[PDB]
């Protein structure tokens, strides 16, 4: 068969003789069936069903409110900026996150054991949080590498939000300025929550009052990269 | 359609996986190394084994170089392990041998050297038409 | 489901002492935390609560409103 052959069959021969009445009876039984599903389903299936019914009820109430209310930009932009997708756009020199949870050194460092005996030497420590190692990085040789910063936990870029411009751009990390828990953590370059980092803001188009281009600024990490797998930062402007 | 043929009575299987049989056609191969048997069941540790009339998957260990790098369906036409037919006769051939076929049953070669089994001839009409002795 | 013909493992309603003690400790910690959060709560609260009033199915609500008018008039006359 070719093209709309089922539609052609419906035109030529119709449907089954009980199809209309059985569809009407099933649509009439939908109310009892939905109540039975609400009172009898179990587990994750029941939870998903209840959530999706909650969504349907919210959408239906919105539609009814709109049908009741049938009988009744923000920032000034030029003509060439009209009809485009524009952002909504919403002394004490305090950072947005002045205090975070402190990290102990046993949480930061785990002991790496070495040796072939049953008793092991335990002088090596491994950093368990994401770090920034900076450019031109070569690891110390293994005989003198006390602190291990694994390559899988190294980050070079972060999602930085400008609070005023209401934009989020992925920017390269320039340096780690201050880890709030320990200067040793700052020296190792650990990227945790509340950390002040230096970011490249060339893509944000910031121009100083004298006409120079500001390509390096400060951001604060607002997330937990060890839990999220990404670094989220807010510019300190 | 998989290669296991229907209407086959139970017989003693004499060729497990890893057996090398002779190659009874003129396709250019000299021997066939069994790596699988079509229609084999599932049982712990049991080697899949075939008999006369069964389709196996086989590699070529010696013969023409263009047949050495491919896996071919084959039909076992002779086996050396004795087996019984429904007429009460126990019998065996002096060697193990098969012929290379396609999955549909037609042979790659054009002639068969030596006899073929009655089971193989009855199950595969192309082998029965290319057999000089049905035996 | 085939619950009647083939029931599954029963869910025990018999408690354990460890779970009872843990639940009691968590309830005490939760009520202390609610007291602390209510103390630290910055939500606005009115000095006078919104009174619901007199129910409509009360058959003498009209006479109650008459009494309220008469009492307010008498209080205004006295003051």
């Amino acid at each position: 068969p070719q093209n709309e052959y089922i539609e052609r069959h419906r035109k030529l021969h119709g449907r089954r003789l009980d199809a209309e009445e059985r569809a009407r009876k099933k649509a009439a039984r939908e109310g009892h069936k939905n109540s039975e599903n609400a009172q009898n389903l179990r587990g994750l299936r029941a939870k998903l069903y209840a959530k999706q019914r909650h969504a349907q009820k919210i959408q239906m109430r919105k539609a009814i409110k709109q049908h009741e209310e049938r009988n009744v930009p923000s920032d000034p932009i030029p003509s060439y900026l009209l009809d485009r997708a524009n952002p909504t756009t919403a002394a004490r020199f305090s950072v947005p996150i002045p205090k975070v949870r402190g990290i102990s050194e046993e949480e930061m460092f785990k002991v790496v054991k070495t040796g072939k005996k049953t008793h092991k030497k335990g002088w090596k420590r491994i950093v368990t949080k994401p770090t920034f190692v900076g450019p031109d990085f070569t690891r110390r040789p293994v005989k003198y590498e006390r602190f291990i910063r694994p390559m899988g936990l190294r980050y070079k870029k972060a999602n930085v939000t400008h609070p005023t411009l209401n934009v989020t751009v992925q920017l390269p990390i320039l340096s780690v300025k201050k880890n709030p828990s320990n200067p040793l953590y700052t020296q190792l370059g650990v990227l945790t929550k509340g950390t002040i980092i230096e970011v490249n803001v060339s893509d944000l188009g910031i121009v100083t009052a004298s006409g120079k281009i500001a390509w390096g600024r400060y951001a604060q990490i607002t997330n937990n990269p060890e839990n999220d797998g990404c670094v989220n930062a807010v510019l300190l402007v | 359609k998989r290669g296991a043929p229907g209407g086959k009575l139970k017989m003693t299987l004499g060729l497990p996986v890893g057996a090398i049989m002779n190659c009874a056609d003129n396709s250019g191969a000299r021997n066939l190394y069994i790596i699988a048997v079509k229609g084999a069941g599932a049982r712990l540790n049991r080697l899949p084994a075939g008999g006369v009339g069964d389709m196996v998957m086989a590699t070529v260990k010696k013969g023409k170089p263009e047949l050495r790098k491919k896996v071919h369906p084959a039909v076992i036409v002779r086996q050396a392990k004795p087996w019984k037919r429904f007429d009460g006769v126990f019998l065996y051939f002096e060697d193990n041998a098969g012929v290379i076929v396609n999955p549909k049953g037609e042979m790659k070669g054009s002639a068969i050297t030596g006899p073929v089994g009655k089971e193989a001839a009855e199950l595969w009409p192309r082998i029965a038409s290319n057999a000089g002795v049905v035996m | 489901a085939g619950t009647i013909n083939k029931p599954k493992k029963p869910t025990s309603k018999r408690k354990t002492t460890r779970l009872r003690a843990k639940i009691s400790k968590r309830a005490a910690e939760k009520k202390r935390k609610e007291r602390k959060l209510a103390r630290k709560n910055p939500e606005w609260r009115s000095k006078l609560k919104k009174d619901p009033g007199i129910p409509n199915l009360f058959p003498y609500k009209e006479r109650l409103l008459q009494q309220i008018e008469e009492e307010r008039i008498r209080r205004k006359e006295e003051l």
Partner: protein, 190 residues
């Protein structure tokens, strides 16, 4: 809330006899006689008027009051069955293989038996036995039609449902394969 008193009324035609004892309702008419055991429902039967049967429930809940409507409709259906009867007309349609329907009456059991052959070319013979008191005839006025008549509406409709469900199409597109036996008409014999 428990309702102190609730009642329903059923009129009885002139040629209809009704006898109720221990909630066992027997209704006899020109066409025959029917029985129904209603002892699973708490109801007080009475003769409120000449030719009117009264149904009462005392100190009952909403569920118990609502059950009296079902009892009323059941007794009215028995009365209609013994007065006018019930008739279901069914049609069998086909595309290529003509459906062969044979109707016989089993002498030992006293029930009708319907044999269906060549349903979409199938070699099996479908056999469906009617409820007692239900007569099946192949219609002569219309093409490919069965008529099931009786005094019991439940028996007639259930026999029609069994014939409808025995010819089920499996593992085929039902938008394309339209073959089957369907209830085409419901009504009274008279």
């Amino acid at each position: 809330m428990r309702y102190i008193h609730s009642e329903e009324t059923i009129p009885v035609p002139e040629n209809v006899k009704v006898s109720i004892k221990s909630r066992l309702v027997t209704v006899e008419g020109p066409r025959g006689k029917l029985q129904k055991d209603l002892s699973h429902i708490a109801v007080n039967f009475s003769v409120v008027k000449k030719g009117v049967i009264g149904l009462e429930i005392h100190h009952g809940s909403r569920k118990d009051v609502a059950a009296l409507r079902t009892v009323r409709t059941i007794i009215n259906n028995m009365i209609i069955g013994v007065t006018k009867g019930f008739k279901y007309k069914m049609r069998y349609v086909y595309a290529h293989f003509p459906i062969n329907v044979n109707v016989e009456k089993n002498a030992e059991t006293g029930c009708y038996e319907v044999e269906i052959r060549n349903f979409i070319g199938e070699k099996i013979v479908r056999k469906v036995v009617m409820a007692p008191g239900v007569e099946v005839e192949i219609s002569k006025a219309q093409k490919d039609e069965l008529i099931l008549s009786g005094n019991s509406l439940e028996a007639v409709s259930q026999s029609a449902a069994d014939i409808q469900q025995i010819c089920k199409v499996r593992n085929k597109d039902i938008r394309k394969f339209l073959d089957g036996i369907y209830v085409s008409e419901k009504g009274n014999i008279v």
